[PDB]
Amino acid sequence: MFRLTRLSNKPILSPIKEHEWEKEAVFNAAVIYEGNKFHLFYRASNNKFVLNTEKPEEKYKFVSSIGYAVSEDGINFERFDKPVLVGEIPQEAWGVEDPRITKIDNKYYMLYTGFGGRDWLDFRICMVWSDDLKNWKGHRIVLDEPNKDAALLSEKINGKYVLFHRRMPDIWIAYSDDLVNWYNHKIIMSPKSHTWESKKIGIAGPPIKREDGWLLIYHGVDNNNVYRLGVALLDLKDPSKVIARQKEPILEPELDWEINGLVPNVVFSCGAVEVNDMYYVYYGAADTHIGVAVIEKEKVKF
Amino acid sequence: MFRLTRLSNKPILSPIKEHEWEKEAVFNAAVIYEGNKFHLFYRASNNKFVLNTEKPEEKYKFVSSIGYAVSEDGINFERFDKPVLVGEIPQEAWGVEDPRITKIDNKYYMLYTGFGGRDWLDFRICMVWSDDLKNWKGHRIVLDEPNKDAALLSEKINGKYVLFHRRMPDIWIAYSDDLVNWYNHKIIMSPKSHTWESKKIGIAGPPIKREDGWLLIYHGVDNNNVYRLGVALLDLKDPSKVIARQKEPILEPELDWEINGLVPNVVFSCGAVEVNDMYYVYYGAADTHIGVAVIEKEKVKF
Amino acid sequence: MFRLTRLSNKPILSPIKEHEWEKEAVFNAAVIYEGNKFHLFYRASNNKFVLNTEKPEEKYKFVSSIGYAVSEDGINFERFDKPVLVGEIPQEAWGVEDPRITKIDNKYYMLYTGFGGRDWLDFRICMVWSDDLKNWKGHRIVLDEPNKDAALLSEKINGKYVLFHRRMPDIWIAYSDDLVNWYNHKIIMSPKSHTWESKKIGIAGPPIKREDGWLLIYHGVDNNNVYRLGVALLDLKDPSKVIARQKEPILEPELDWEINGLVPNVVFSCGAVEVNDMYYVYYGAADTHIGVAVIEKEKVKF
Amino acid sequence: MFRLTRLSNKPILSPIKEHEWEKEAVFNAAVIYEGNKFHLFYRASNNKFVLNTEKPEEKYKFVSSIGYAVSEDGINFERFDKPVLVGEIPQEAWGVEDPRITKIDNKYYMLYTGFGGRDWLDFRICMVWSDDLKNWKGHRIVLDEPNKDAALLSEKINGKYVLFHRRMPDIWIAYSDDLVNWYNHKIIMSPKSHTWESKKIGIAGPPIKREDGWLLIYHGVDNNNVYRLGVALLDLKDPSKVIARQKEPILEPELDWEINGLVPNVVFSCGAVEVNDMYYVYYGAADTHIGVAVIEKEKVKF
């Protein structure tokens, strides 16, 4: 088995109480590595996360925003006073969550969860895109259904866009001619009962192309809602086929700010990039902080 | 197949009309047996409990206080003219409810529900502690979320403090290194459909240590909001594991002042202590009075 | 140790398919003995009773009406083309159920359940009255709450009217000065676990005055929703006190048309009169037909 | 604990494109072992299943038929050109579903869900019978209510026909003297929260008589609508009494044609037979194909 190794025993991004939109939490962050820079797009919450109510209650409302941070070494990030993305329509009344960014041809696609807070199924995969990672346009509901953990493949298979999504509790794949209509939905990977990944699974960041397949980092949730990261390999030509899947996780809550926090016992990645023959996996921790762990790509064997 | 036996067919503590803070109800009492004396910390209400309005309304406002009473024989108590704990404004503006007190090493921890009355979900588990059952301090919100039916285990498990709580409608467990931050949340016990405990369950008093495990008295609520008491046995080394659970209740409303009162059909315990090879279980009755019922320790078997 | 004896092995009243309002069911009938005639006011349903849906569904809507029938011998009844009372639309959209008629000071009070059908709790005790059993008037919601199984006592107690009602699952008593406002609500009788009357109880017909107390026939419901009739005796001067209660039912489904029907396994009385020192107990059978059973006044011994 | 073992990693029956009535799905099959042959009566659909519309839409109409197939070995089946049961119009306009066939005293009773498609509650338990498995007659609505998952016991109990049915979400039992009118309704088994069988349960095929009880294979539905097979044992003399119930499933969606199909994540049995000390469990897979799994009888242990 292989596993990620943290670069810091402390977060690389933490909430800023002076900033309302990231007052309580910064986590679950998309990343792409473009101009020799790490472009990090992080979920941020103005509030703690009451989840145990029958419906989302306005008195316990939290608002998710996406922030931007940039770094050259992967560790130290420059941050900004304001978020780059917020919810603007009622379906995103409780904000925009867990972004995954994929570059296809020469455009960047950010897939996030729009949460409206009207009930606990009131969340949708949404998409905006940009030429430049700065000006997001063309907001759309990707699937009109309670769904999340969505990512696009960085290229087309047989001329089709590929979407990973997550009809509970499985990782699903779907295909599109036009990034509008999705078809040939199917389950590509399922939880394993009586294990750390028993309750549900979902893609982590967008799959990373390798020579032996597409690297599929994913999160698994156990019966007590611990989020841990696992890893699987998709067939290179047919990313609907899992060709390998590591039995044990590659990241689990270990440090205090991963075990303890707003949502205890969570590590969760929305983004990972290949940089200098290493995979940089940025992860939310306890839905409160962002850490980063790496693995030399040479060590990724199944 | 065992039951509690009421020590009296009359309440042992009743409201005092002359005391505003306990004019209408005394009930749901934490219990500690120290210095050959029963220490009762009882919920007290200045008012009946109108609960069927959309929001808590000032004209139906009730305020819970924690009063204190002490007894050598368990039946006759010395009472006090003012309560020993009242709610801070505004988070506990409608008062402090259902204390459970746990002695860990040489400190006493009182967990109770702070109710702010700003919404019907405006309640949370709070904690105060004392080394003497007299000077309570160090107030903190245990879980910042709508939650109640909370109690500490009387000792640490693998070096962690153990919290029992109640995200609706199950009995949960959680662990802490510092009595501030809780993690490893786990459901340990659930309602049982089509039984007296179908709607919801919650811990009673803190679990009593035995050689065969932890005695976990609890309350079950049926479809008609009748509150009864039941018993389970937790594993001694992992109290998250229920190793036995009696099907039948050990106490149910039977006497007129358990069936009739401010909230009909309630027996509810927030404390039970081992004295002279007997379990003394103090219980609110109809959210109006306090009774006491016992079981010979030898009769506790599953 | 005592039981009712069916007068007839035949329903004394059955639905009439050609009459929409009583096409499927005649049952749960109020009865008054006046002018040496049995005056039966029976619940009639246009439809079968689909009760297993999560909510009442318009497609399975049933409409209860109240018909009149009159007999001189209490066995053979004359009937009429049209109901005497109908649910006013929409507040009683699914009709008017289970009438209980009490005579007080030459006025007849009919208490019935108005059912709006908007959810399964959309029911309440309504009351009309008359001084001739023909011209019903004065409709009012007796208690603004989900409630049923209501009857008035046939005289005042210490100057106050007496209402029996049924906040689930118990028989309740309440008092009024004006037949509009009720106070001093109190449970007087409860189901008994692990018996034929375990799930709930409710009053049957209005209590019958005796020299030794108030005869309180009631229905009890077991864990499988079988309806049987029990009997208790209320203190003559304080009918809040049950002074006797028979362990075993006095009537239970035995005949095919009591065991089988629109609601299987039901006998249910809303009406019982004393005629020549016999109690004539009229009963719905399987919510489909009406039977009559009797017991000599002298054999009512507890 | 024990598990079924699939006889093939491929379906034993699959849709047949040139037969419209079974063009898209063959699944949920009744089975009878007579004349040393497996007689399979399988549900068949002319269409994919759109189930998430607000009402059953003509534009997505599917029609279920019952096809017949026969096999010597239980694996290789001869099939036929026409279905053997189709729905009456209009109450069964969307066809006849999920047959369970019980032999009682030289008569064969097929219980199925008749679905009329007029709304999503427009289904009911229907029954036909034959003495030859070929000439089905005596159509009747078994319970005139939204209900399904029905099967008859292969014997009477104290002279009574025994019906298993499923008022949501439990397995119910009921009894009849005439195969027309049903009474003594009783819940016998219920879903279990926070398990694979939390949402609802329903009988699989008719229970199989054993020396130690009736084998009740059933299906359990989790919170994500995954269908799995479980197994319980009913008391031999009193099959309303569950005397054992395995915690783990005996069969779960595992193969791709069980996980992906017209309805994902479904294994479902309507029939199982004992041949030569093995139970053959026929199961629909993803509401699309039919597989068959077995368990040696010796290994069936509670």
Ligand SMILES: OC[C@H]1O[C@H](O)[C@@H](O)[C@@H](O)[C@@H]1O
């Ligand atoms: O998407 C709504 C909600 O779903 C889950 O509860 C978590 O992923 C939350 O962080 C999220 O906000």
Ligand SMILES: OC[C@H]1O[C@H](O)[C@@H](O)[C@@H](O)[C@@H]1O
């Ligand atoms: O906790 C707030 C409120 O919760 C419930 O409604 C009851 O337990 C009340 O007694 C309590 O005051």
Ligand SMILES: OC[C@H]1O[C@H](O)[C@@H](O)[C@@H](O)[C@@H]1O
């Ligand atoms: O009152 C609503 C409804 O309640 C019960 O289900 C039965 O008594 C029905 O006959 C009645 O219509």
Ligand SMILES: OC[C@H]1O[C@H](O)[C@@H](O)[C@@H](O)[C@@H]1O
């Ligand atoms: O019963 C009607 C309809 O409802 C269910 O959800 C499914 O089993 C369908 O296959 C069936 O046709």
Ligand SMILES: [Zn+2]
């Ligand atoms: Zn700033």
Ligand SMILES: [Zn+2]
């Ligand atoms: Zn959106």
Ligand SMILES: [Zn+2]
């Ligand atoms: Zn996820």
Ligand SMILES: [Zn+2]
């Ligand atoms: Zn005083």
Ligand SMILES: [Zn+2]
């Ligand atoms: Zn507090």
Ligand SMILES: [Zn+2]
């Ligand atoms: Zn639960």
Ligand SMILES: [Zn+2]
């Ligand atoms: Zn509780």
Ligand SMILES: [Zn+2]
């Ligand atoms: Zn019981």
Ligand SMILES: [Zn+2]
């Ligand atoms: Zn006529």
Ligand SMILES: [Zn+2]
């Ligand atoms: Zn009315």
Ligand SMILES: [Zn+2]
């Ligand atoms: Zn009733």
Ligand SMILES: [Zn+2]
């Ligand atoms: Zn009998």
